[PDB]
Amino acid sequence: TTHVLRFGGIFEYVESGPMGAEELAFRFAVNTINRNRTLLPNTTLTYDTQKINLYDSFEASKKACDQLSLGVAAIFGPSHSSSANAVQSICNALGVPHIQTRWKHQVSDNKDSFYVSLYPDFSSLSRAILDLVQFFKWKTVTVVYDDSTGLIRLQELIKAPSRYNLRLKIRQLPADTKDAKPLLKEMKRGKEFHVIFDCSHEMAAGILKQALAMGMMTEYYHYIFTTLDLFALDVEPYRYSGVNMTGFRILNTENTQVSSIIEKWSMERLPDSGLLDGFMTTDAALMYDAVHVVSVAVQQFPQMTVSSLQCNRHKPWRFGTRFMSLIKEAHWEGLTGRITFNKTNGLRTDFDLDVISLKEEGLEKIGTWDPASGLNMTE
Amino acid sequence: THVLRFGGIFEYVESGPMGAEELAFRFAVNTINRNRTLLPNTTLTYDTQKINLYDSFEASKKACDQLSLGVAAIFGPSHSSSANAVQSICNALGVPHIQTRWKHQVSDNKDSFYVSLYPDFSSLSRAILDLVQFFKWKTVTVVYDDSTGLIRLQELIKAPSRYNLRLKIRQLPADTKDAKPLLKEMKRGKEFHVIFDCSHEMAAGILKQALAMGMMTEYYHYIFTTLDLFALDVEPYRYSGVNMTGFRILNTENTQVSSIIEKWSMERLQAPPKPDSGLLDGFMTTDAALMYDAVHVVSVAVQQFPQMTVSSLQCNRHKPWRFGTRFMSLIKEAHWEGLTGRITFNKTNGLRTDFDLDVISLKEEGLEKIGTWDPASGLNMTE
Ligand SMILES: *[C@@H]1O[C@H](CO)[C@@H](O)[C@H](O)[C@H]1NC(C)=O
Ligand SMILES: *[C@@H]1O[C@H](CO)[C@@H](O)[C@H](O)[C@H]1NC(C)=O
Ligand SMILES: *[C@@H]1O[C@H](CO)[C@@H](O)[C@H](O)[C@H]1NC(C)=O
Ligand SMILES: *[C@@H]1O[C@H](CO)[C@@H](O)[C@H](O)[C@H]1NC(C)=O
Ligand SMILES: *[C@@H]1O[C@H](CO)[C@@H](O)[C@H](O)[C@H]1NC(C)=O
Ligand SMILES: *[C@@H]1O[C@H](CO)[C@@H](O)[C@H](O)[C@H]1NC(C)=O
Ligand SMILES: *[C@@H]1O[C@H](CO)[C@@H](O)[C@H](O)[C@H]1NC(C)=O
Ligand SMILES: *[C@H]1O[C@H](CO)[C@@H](O)[C@H](O)[C@H]1NC(C)=O
Ligand SMILES: [Ca+2]
Ligand SMILES: [Ca+2]
């Protein structure tokens, strides 16, 4: 009873240093499962990792074909959206499950059915952001987004001013944070004390610097962050100013089992950035959870074996339709909590969140949120 | 006598008439061949592949095939996610990719082998704005079709921080047939000034629900992002005295353009639009006049580069085309007077950020020109 089952992964290219955090979580999971007797006892997980420049969809395609030709049971495809788009179409045509860990816009007309996404969908996250804004009883707010795509992402937030009694201004960051000051100066001048920053944690770390410099880290302002990697941020410079800072957290650290696995990650890993060294970002804990979730579906389908499919020949995989289905019905308790997909969408629309805020002793849990029972504060 | 072949990827119609874009493509090619003054010694040929527009994989396989037959340009697909993939491929093999439909150009993306003939709404958003301020609106309601319209009209959505304006954002549901619950909220909220961001086909259908709801009156004013406003049947509404305003890129005012539009309404083999569609039969949409203009603009660059010839490139082998970098450049510097007016690309972006517009509004005697707009001198009304 020894069977070789191979996953493919397409990751970011760093010709200048260490492998990315996602590719590391991928390999770390595979190894952890192999060492685990209870999961895939008779089965042994192997893999093939290709590295590409993330916005060359053409390259992401050539490498997705190569892996379908070696034989792969799933492509844990790329992060960037336009490259994940192309690998999604390919995986569909050849009926190999595509596992996505990062959000991208699913065009409506698109009928691809061979995929799932582990990123918390903000059909839900937009509503969690909203539930939070109403709890603080804000009546004016200012949404500051990074790249145009954040409007599609937070569209349920942008529309609320027609239903509820709310008035928001929409501002954008410039390409480089190093002059987000002219903008911050307009918000200051306009007494925009309640703000929602829609950007990556790296951008958030850099914006809070400009904000401090501008005298906007005080008891007057309150900042809400869409980013789930709020704990990734160094908070020493601001916890005494008594700004308010709130965001969500998918990464279930409250559990000791998750904390210990996060520590083995800070291990076997490694300034003015504003980020904490040795921290597992959410994008990485999701990849680790995607390998585990797919594997839970593999343990239920021993009959299944890999197959060498070609992008020119057009012979859909034989166990494709059946595997992709086993996946969508999967249940797993990963680093990021309850995993369950939406049979309809393939998306993750139901999950649990910890709502975290900046007290004087650092970031702290002040409640929970799930789409069913909404916000649930502890006081 | 030299044979130069363009490739085109178009929408699949099993098995009715060929789409309007593919027809404008073939119509242009033929018109140029018959024209002595353009490509006199050169003869244009082509290969048209048909694909399902959201299978980017299929649009890829077919883009490779044409690069292998040998093509000087792929007038790639319309849908965005398929035009994305063909854009990357064209880039890797240095064959110009000609786009005629808007799509979001991700910022990090460095592909340089392409141009887009669709009027960019870094400019169109500003033209919509210039118009809103001329009417001196202080409240407006933007209704968009699919999420992507927010990225498109982002310069409009942000204006409430600069100017004195207050807009509500509403969305249409998948199917127009119940845009009534929404229209009923706008009515109840006295949202008399509205901007509809959707296709003309959706606009035709929404105006029906609006009439039914008693919102086609002298109280309402609707602005349309769509450039195909003249595509709409306007008989049912021109007497109600609603106000209806939008822009028009298609230079019909010119007789030469009108006659070519007439040869197009002719030779058209598509069943008239179903009654109850709300559209006029035999009408050249802007998406089609752009494709006709894209074949002509590229051809103006070909006439300047006789040395150039086609080459059979493979998607596995990786040997960029020999005249690629030089052709793609001749294109970006092109100037053409097409059906849609002044064509000129932005050397920086490859996009069409400078163009001319006719601003058109619904008078009682049908749709009418009431001014112009170009990014330089902004709005320019006649009164
Ligand atoms: C807001 O700021 C003050 C001072 O930092 C703090 O005491 C309060 O608890 C904060 N509010 C929340 C929701 O954390
Ligand atoms: C699946 O997706 C839709 C749209 O996002 C959502 O409304 C629906 O409730 C989801 N289904 C489940 C089972 O959660
Ligand atoms: C909400 O939170 C309270 C206290 O934190 C907890 O006791 C309760 O069970 C939660 N309710 C639900 C159903 O989420
Ligand atoms: C095409 O020839 C027509 C005459 O049919 C002429 O009017 C027009 O200028 C020509 N186009 C070009 C490129 O000169
Ligand atoms: C809007 O008002 C009436 C129709 O109700 C029309 O006569 C008038 O010309 C319109 N205004 C413009 C600028 O189109
Ligand atoms: C197009 O170039 C013009 C100047 O030639 C410039 O104003 C504009 O920024 C360019 N395109 C964009 C959208 O950046
Ligand atoms: C605006 O239009 C008028 C005619 O109505 C014309 O005389 C004038 O030149 C135009 N302005 C410019 C330069 O766009
Ligand atoms: C293997 O992981 C640990 C032991 O290493 C065990 O607690 C866990 O349940 C196993 N994995 C599963 C859930 O099959
Ligand atoms: Ca194992
Ligand atoms: Ca000719």
Curated annotation (Swiss-Prot), chain B:
One of its GO terms (molecular function) is scaffold protein binding. The keyword Ubl conjugation applies. Residues 1-383 are extracellular. Its main location: membrane. Sumoylation mediates kainate receptor-mediated endocytosis and regulates synaptic transmission. Sumoylation is enhanced by PIAS3 and desumoylated by SENP1. GO terms for cellular component: axon; dendrite; dendrite cytoplasm; glutamatergic synapse; hippocampal mossy fiber to CA3 synapse; ionotropic glutamate receptor complex; kainate selective glutamate receptor complex; membrane. Highest expression is found in the olfactory lobe, piriform cortex, dentate gyrus, hippocampus, granular cell layer of the cerebellum, and in caudate-putamen. Glycans are attached at N35, N41, N243, N346, N380. The chain holds residues 33 to 415 of 908 of the full protein. The keyword Phosphoprotein applies. This is Glutamate receptor ionotropic, kainate 2. Keywords: Cell membrane, Disulfide bond, Glycoprotein, Ion channel, Ion transport, Isopeptide bond, Ligand-gated ion channel, Membrane, Phosphoprotein, Postsynaptic cell membrane, Receptor, Signal, Synapse, Transmembrane, Transmembrane helix, Transport, Ubl conjugation. Belongs to the glutamate-gated ion channel (TC 1.A.10.1) family. GRIK2 subfamily. Disulfide bonds join C64-C315. The postsynaptic actions of Glu are mediated by a variety of receptors that are named according to their selective agonists. This receptor binds domoate > kainate > quisqualate > glutamate. It does not bind AMPA without coexpression with GRIK5. GO terms for biological process: behavioral fear response; chemical synaptic transmission; detection of cold stimulus involved in thermoception; excitatory postsynaptic potential; inhibitory postsynaptic potential; intracellular calcium ion homeostasis; modulation of chemical synaptic transmission; modulation of excitatory postsynaptic potential. Homotetramer and heterotetramer with GRIK5. Tetramers may be formed by the dimerization of dimers. Assembles into a kainate-gated homomeric channel that does not bind AMPA. Can form functional heteromeric receptors with GRIK4 and GRIK5. Can form functional heteromeric receptors with GRIK3. Interacts with DLG4. Interacts with NETO2. Interacts (via C-terminus) with KLHL17 (via kelch repeats); the interaction targets GRIK2 for degradation via ubiquitin-proteasome pathway.
